[PDB]
Design a binder for this molecule. Structure first.
Ligand SMILES: Nc1ncnc2c1ncn2[C@@H]1O[C@H](COP(=O)(O)OP(=O)(O)O)[C@@H](O)[C@H]1O
Ligand SMILES: Nc1ncnc2c1ncn2[C@@H]1O[C@H](COP(=O)(O)OP(=O)(O)O)[C@@H](O)[C@H]1O
Lengths: 244, 244
């Protein structure tokens, strides 16, 4: 059966979507079959980062009983994905019931992949914390800024309070120096272990790199736009270390 | 009798909290009575940016039969504010009835201010949209990035579809050149004006500035840390133009 990963964060602006897509693409390149799901319904960024014209999206599954398998889009390197959507006139969100049915139709087309990767909406919500208790791995993205780190810790506290028992792995992104990344992680590891009795791990450290910004403007993922960039190697390396 | 302003964004990481805080400080410095409310309950960032330690916050208000009046904290330059809080063993979310409670109790002190400024959670929610219709002005913050701009559009579309009659004013933050701010605004004004038949205004353009990031690490608001910085003058002049 496929391994499920949810990528999350304390707050937006930590590069969580960029990490999700570029980590998924690295997994694809190693030869795995990956389905990436943009769980930001009506506010999805996965399509934009690939520079793909908006077409059918998850929000459409909410709105026409269309089966999930027809939402599945092909991306570079054999990556499959499902977009969050541009939405209709009015706002639409997920509740626990609709989350439930979604998970059901998902396993119907899940068995094909080695990995199912969920790009979660940033931060916490009742419905998001509900979704997160089922996954095998929870990735938590943070940067070295105090706001991002404080919010990452809160997020881990809430997922834990809401009975998530999944292993938490930290991705320290936008690190200035490699030591700085380890020290961000030590701080988070200290507070989670002492206050929550929760032992977390470091998935990897991604440096601050202009290539990322360049990749976003040009709408071409950085691991593909420049595989030799520092961030690109850091993410390829993270994926390699994660995979068996 | 105060004027109410909700500062919103399509996605996090656009500088919204920094803009909310530094714009409020500029208004207070012009001599107005300002109350800033951090609506990111359980994930408050305003305390952090100010370098002030915890104290009571919305997270203590939520569960614990306590009047908003007692959450008011004194910030620099005579700014008053209410912190979102660090939580809370468990996640807690504003629902329709808690918003009513909030807005009701808010009327007990609203009278003592010229401006109430709500630093809203980023993105949309059924709850946020219910909150955003008792406000006079909606500021929408974006950067020149395509993800940020697309999300800002969708947020404006959602607020408009939910019956919001308030004028939308855009803040383009992290502009590389002042001209890029106009390029960003022109695109947004275009798609909103042609598709939604909604006339939006430019509140101002804030340049990319290392000073901002320095202010976050130093936990001292950038307009106070260095009043001469480019971003600091931009925000000060934005507030001057907005105030009577
Ligand atoms: N490693 C990095 N180096 C430089 N900029 C980065 C890096 N990671 C992320 N960013 C910047 O952060 C912005 C927001 O990234 P995004 O993936 O949208 O984050 P989130 O999903 O956390 O909001 C990007 O558009 C880019 O400017
Ligand atoms: N004008 C700017 N110049 C440089 N960096 C900025 C600017 N505005 C925001 N930032 C950066 O963006 C980060 C996130 O800002 P924040 O106010 O927390 O955004 P949001 O509330 O939209 O998530 C800041 O800590 C800082 O690194």
């Amino acid at each position: 059966s496929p391994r499920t990963i949810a990528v999350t964060s304390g707050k937006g602006g930590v590069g969580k979507s960029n990490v999700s897509l570029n980590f998924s693409l690295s997994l694809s390149k190693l030869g795995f079959r990956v389905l990436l799901l943009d769980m930001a319904i009506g506010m999805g960024n996965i399509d934009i980062l690939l520079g793909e014209s908006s077409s059918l999206a998850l929000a459409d599954w909410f709105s026409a009983r269309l089966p999930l398998s027809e939402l599945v889009k092909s991306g570079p390197e054999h990556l499959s994905y499902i977009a969050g959507g541009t939405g209709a006139a009015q706002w639409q969100g997920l509740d626990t019931a609709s989350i439930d049915r979604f998970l059901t139709e998902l396993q119907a087309v899940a068995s094909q992949y080695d990995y199912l990767i969920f790009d979660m909406g940033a931060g916490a919500s009742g419905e998001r914390l509900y979704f997160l208790k089922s996954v095998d791995d929870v990735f938590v993205v943070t940067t070295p800024e105090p706001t991002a780190m404080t919010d990452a810790y809160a997020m881990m506290k809430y997922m834990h309070a809401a009975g998530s028992e999944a292993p938490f792995s930290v991705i320290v992104n936008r690190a200035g120096k490699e030591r700085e990344g380890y020290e961000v992680f030590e701080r988070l590891k200290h507070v989670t272990g002492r206050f929550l009795n929760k032992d977390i791990a470091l998935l990897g450290i991604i440096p601050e790199d202009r290539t990322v910004a360049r990749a976003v403007v040009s709408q071409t993922p950085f691991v593909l736009l420049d595989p030799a960039a520092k961030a690109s190697k850091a993410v390829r390396q993270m994926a390699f270390r994660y995979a068996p």
